[PDB]
Symmetry: D2
Subunit: 423 residues, 4 copies
């Protein structure tokens, strides 16, 4: 007699778990953590309020969190990402899931509500919308929270905003910038997928072409290397002298966007800033110049300055518009300045383990370890995330000998690197 | 008319000054740091006791410190490294330099001590490269040691010595780890792990690595550089690790993580870059196939238990410089490079650009700790501030004619950042 | 007033001409070849029968031929590829074009035949892309076929068809293999094997290859490109080969050469790029581990015996476009892409620069064979002359603003070479 | 009672063969060819006159050639390269070896003599000095020769000179440009070793530096890729439009040497030409610019124009001179314009097998297969060279199935590629 949930369940729980069964086969790292951490119950009594994508992979995390003794009350962090069939499966398992595909902005806040009120220990968030809603609607529930586990870039920025500015009164965990997760998201975004959206939408070869990549951070470094590999001539713009010196040494020219704006075939933004590519820059670009945002939002390129009456827009294909100037000049604008963009199950597994361990760490943390500030996942916990993914490669880790562990000032299991280690 | 110096240099100043003049054209980033902060004398009142190599490059650092108001008393960190000519030009310039080429072990500790004690001289700062001068001030003059405003250390073992006193509470003075400061760290990594990583190995071997099987022990800065270099030449690289993060990094970089024994009998090359002792033991050396190459790109000479190969049944043949063939009674030989030591310690010298990065880091690390308020640094080892790291990088940008973009008021408002202030958070790995 | 054309285009010429005008800015190398050889009309008297895609790029080639004095009669090599608008502008320009989008198999052979026979028209040259027009002239009009001055073929199967007649003595006319001409070959290799090699695979899969085990069957142009691309992402790549040179190349590039069976049960991805039949047989598909990906980057759809997977005990589920999950009775599924066909044939189009290289090669291959003296080419298939290959490359250099160095009389005397003549020997692989 | 030889043998034959025994262990590809081709005796009666380096590796080829039924009369192609101890070992084995270290230019031609006259079938050469000596001293012995097997660049050029110009009246084998050998020499020279001499002698890092590589052939492509990998900014000069287009597409600028001569930190020649870097170029180079020849001879850079009285030479280290101009400007000249430069035993094994099979092919060739021209080693013979080196990697070659070999128009063992194949 299941009541505590809100999904559009049509006996979908039988099919829903069958798609989770496939996901469980693909994320054997969490099932190992489930098996290894079982019995001990490190989340015994934990009342977790979650807000993330309701997918078959996520179910493996929620069903793992609940298997380690936690009370799961959940919501969807997006109004279209909910895999209703898996959501309906979670409802039958006992998980208080309030989520469906095609929910409105009112249904969205309604689900976050039914998730909070009906003594919530912890909050697992992806976005920070649930965290901010508990910050302006239930502040006495908020001050009693043991820890906020955040995986989103903006959500974590919102937490760093509260901190130091005198507002954060609860210890937080930045899992986005945590070592094992950051490094793995870097490999997927900046190494593997970096030019997939750009190659998919353009049908030109980058060999022998001139490109300008704005920003030489994670995305910029990844982008330039991939473009360099293809035989493209790449130029870089930077505000950070460390990143600029890094570009110089990597055989790239560090320029001001205007020095190359008139000759480059392709313009790429990956800064996280606004008005990097302005009206003046789009006016100086040579005809057919590809304009691409590989950073955030749609403010990196001032696309709003191209809606004026003299310019005309012609839709070439999906996610490709031609913005034509009265002199006949056209720029190939990809996805209206938005990031072109399903995350691989192995990437989610890395994130899910980091999130799971971040909850176990903050929940069982002593009163004096974590102050009212944002923190990264402990080094030994970061090592545990990596270790749980090693059997997927049949990787044989070496154990330190008693004299070896005595030589280097460290424990046979303990943190192997200093705090400032960059990997 | 001054006699406050000890050099062999019998009017070698004129010639030596020309070498500093030549060096100053290559240390253009230090001359800028000199020019930009002079007249404001940020080291006015600093009494610095130094122990580093005396070269025409180092001399530019010593003189930038003297130009920023500091009063220097210098020593050599090595008994062979001293370029006497520059030591003269410095002594003639007024710097209290106490060094020459061809020192004995007793002369080495005489000079170090000459820096520490003098009538009316009390040291503010210690700039070391090795830690030997620091261990000397710590044990010979503990009362002077407690009164030092800050230690700036270059060396790996010297910094680890400083980190050891911390967590043991023997460190009563703040320390600056320049070795792991971003700009300096990233630059050494590029020199050591990217550009030079196979130089020593290629120089001493005369085989091609393409098509070969190599086992690299450790996947840290050196291991990563090494494996990339070997991957690019066509070598099949196997990795051993104790750290599951570094091992997962290797799995994701296309390498298999194995226990040393799983491949020891099939690899053509064995490389150690751990910083550990007995990574390759007698057991491993015995199981290696004939013509296997054994190399240490890590620390000291204890990564491979070379002393276990000094048994009467084994026969040593130096076939080339730094190359020994250790032949077993059954005829099997292992090609052992530099007797288990790092090869680069007996091959070449550090590029002036790498020296420029380091010297700039050192000068700013001394300017920081000296002018630092209390409570900003306690009795611990710290890394160079981000705005200082950025400045080290910025001073080296004109040599590439780099054009840095400056944030607009609207742009710098969007990010919670200063137009010229720190651009990255503390946990930024770059 | 002419009616010598068959197009659907009801005054579509004005619009279509604008597309050729747009294309001519991207085919700048052909406009130069046009401009440089015009007035000298090297194709004056050539009666060319063509069968290629009708696009605004191809139209620039057809018009360069008509501008060099040639008289053209064109057909489409595909029943879907025709851009009708350009077909109008060409018909209006005077070219005898016989093509439109949405042809039936019977319409396709009607147009091909319309090109071949006409009152007072006898073909000098055949420009094909597929070989279907060549097989048609060879069997329907053998008397016209023996009188053709030269065949210039673009396609892989068309060229192999031409190479088959040779050594069998059925080829009575000289043929130009543009597919394996240096400039064209090196350019396709860069597009197909370097730039696009994993595009189809990345588009249809949603997994990361870094850390995965991949077996690539064949280490030719495609296999080499593929393995490099996979090596760079962090994948562990295994190679299978029949050719010991290509296998030794893989051994030297850091890959293990294995028999397909040695790794079939452990690989995450299987790739075929051989050009052979039954490289991956039912036995292999049965031994693949659950979630294995099967991809064909070779020819047709016979490299993987997909027809052996159409048994009643196997269940097919199209999870995405061009992605089928073939599930066994025990639950094990294999992710099979494009039903064993090449993915690129249903994803994108060929870059205009690649088209420019090819079109330039084709025009010069027709200028060569038409103006070629007898005894220079016999009843065999030949590659484009070196000085012509150099010219194809030279015509594309200004788009990069390349500055070619010219040999001095002393320099060109030192090497047995002409200042502008052939620069490399015949066996030069580049 | 050994007489037919000329070495400085002091019972060195006992130690000599012990160094060959080590070499035999390292080139098991030739011992396999020795074993496989034994019994058949494809060189039965062959009277080979050889001129190459007398090393422990070479001994394995000579002792293999003689093991396949050939009569070995040998000389040294260089006056300093002879490993006397191995030469003395060959003398005892029955090989007519006339060679020693430190022989004069008169001793050199004397040894080539005692090698020819005492009915020589074949000639195996490395240089073409022995081939030219049989061309101007014994022309009736020369016209009776079945084939010339040449491995040297200049020696092969000398043969291509005779051919077409109406002088070559004997079929030749170009083993230098033969597929398996060319590709393997390319890997050693242009991939593995390309920057070893330059890195060894300079002590600067190439990251962030500007380089000019003159020529984009085998050496140029190899050099630029290695420099590109290190983060250097590389520019290229070319005379060949195919090679120039190749550079463009590889993300390099194709320039005239003068456009970059004043800004580049490093100048590299790999053209095979003379006066690429002239007096005018060395006068425009910025102070400390490294000048390096990676091509041929010492004529690529006009070093002879820097001996004039206004310039001064200062020897920095071994193979590094500073050429100082009166204005104080200095250029770092490496090895007086000469190539900086022991070849690995696996490379020699590839060459030795190609040479061995080139001799078996031309000796047993029918009268009508090879005319009076220079040829490359047959494709199936090239495949045999590669196959014999595969067990060193434990490489498992796939055998074509009867229907597979029927599908592609080829034999289960025959040439797998067309003649124009570039690999
Ligand atoms: N493309 C993707 O797959 C993807 C994925 C996740 C996030 N992002 C977003 O992309 C942006 C960049 O991500 P990152 O991880 O590379 O960040 P990062 O902080 O590592 O790098 C951003 C870089 O841009 C530089 N920069 C900032 N303003 C600039 C300016 N206006 N002109 C030139 N350079 C400037 C910064 O100094 C920094 O080096 C962020 O907003 C990030 O959230 C992109
Ligand atoms: N080769 C060079 O040019 C060079 C230069 C400077 C310093 N070093 C020295 O080399 C050592 C390594 O340098 P690094 O920069 O790589 O340091 P690092 O800490 O970044 O890397 C050391 C790695 O070795 C691994 N490791 C430790 N014990 C192991 C074991 N026994 N088996 C397998 N792996 C093991 C660790 O997990 C770590 O990742 C240090 O002592 C350093 O001082 C070498
Ligand atoms: N992927 C693409 O974009 C693309 C593009 C054009 C053509 N192709 C086609 O793909 C096929 C291969 O192209 P290529 O350019 O690599 O040709 P290629 O001849 O250069 O390479 C084929 C390789 O496959 C090897 N091989 C043959 N049978 C084998 C076997 N059964 N097992 C293992 N290896 C085997 C051969 O030794 C040869 O090296 C051709 O039919 C070609 O038309 C693919
Ligand atoms: N560095 C080494 O390890 C090494 C080894 C063997 C031989 N070589 C010699 O080096 C030279 C180059 O060898 P390769 O195999 O690269 O030859 P290659 O024929 O493959 O390339 C030479 C290139 O230089 C270009 N070129 C010729 N003259 C030029 C000019 N004056 N200006 C600019 N470019 C010019 C040619 O077009 C050609 O592309 C040859 O003499 C060769 O014998 C060098």
């Amino acid at each position: 007699g299941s009541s505590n949930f809100c999904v559009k369940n049509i006996k979908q729980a039988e099919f829903g778990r069958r798609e989770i069964e496939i996901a469980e086969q693909d994320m054997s790292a969490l099932i190992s953590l489930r098996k290894r951490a079982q019995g001990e119950k490190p989340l015994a009594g934990a009342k977790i309020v979650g807000c993330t994508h309701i997918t078959a992979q996520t179910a493996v995390l929620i069903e793992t969190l609940c298997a380690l003794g936690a009370q799961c009350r959940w919501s969807a962090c997006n109004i279209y990402s909910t895999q209703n069939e898996v959501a309906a499966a979670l409802a039958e398992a006992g998980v208080a899931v309030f989520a469906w595909k095609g929910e409105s902005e009112d249904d969205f806040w309604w689900c976050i509500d039914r998730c909070v009120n009906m003594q919530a220990n912890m909050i697992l968030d992806d976005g920070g919308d649930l965290t901010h809603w508990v910050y302006k609607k239930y502040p006495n529930v908020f001050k009693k929270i043991r820890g906020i586990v955040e995986e989103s870039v903006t959500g974590v920025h919102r937490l760093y905003q509260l901190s130091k500015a005198g507002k954060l009164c609860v210890p937080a965990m930045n899992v986005n910038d945590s070592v094992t997760k950051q490094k793995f998201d870097n490999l997927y975004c900046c190494r593997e997928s970096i030019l997939d959206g750009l190659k998919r939408t353009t049908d030109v070869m980058f060999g022998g072409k001139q490109v300008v990549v704005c920003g030489y951070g994670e995305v910029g470094k990844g982008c330039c290397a991939a473009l360099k590999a293809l035989g493209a001539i790449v130029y870089i713009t930077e505000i950070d002298p460390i990143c600029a010196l890094q570009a110089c040494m990597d055989g790239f020219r560090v320029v001001k966007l205007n020095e190359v704006i008139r000759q480059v075939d392709v313009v790429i933004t990956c800064t996280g800033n606004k008005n990097v590519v302005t009206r003046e820059h789009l006016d100086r670009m040579k005809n057919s110049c590809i304009v691409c945002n590989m950073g955030h939002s749609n403010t990196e390129i001032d696309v709003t300055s191209l809606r004026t009456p003299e310019l005309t827009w012609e839709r070439v294909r999906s996610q490709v518009d031609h913005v034509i100037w009265p002199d006949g000049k056209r720029v190939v604008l990809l996805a209206e300045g938005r990031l072109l963009n399903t995350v691989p199950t192995f990437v989610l597994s890395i994130t899910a383990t980091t999130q799971a361990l971040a909850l176990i760490e903050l929940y069982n943390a002593p009163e004096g370890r974590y102050k009212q500030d944002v923190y990264l996942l402990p080094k030994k916990m970061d090592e545990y995330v990596a270790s749980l993914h090693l059997p997927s490669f049949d990787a044989h880790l070496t154990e330190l000998a008693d004299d070896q562990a005595k030589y280097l000032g460290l424990n046979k299991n303990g943190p192997f690197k200093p705090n400032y280690y960059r990997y």
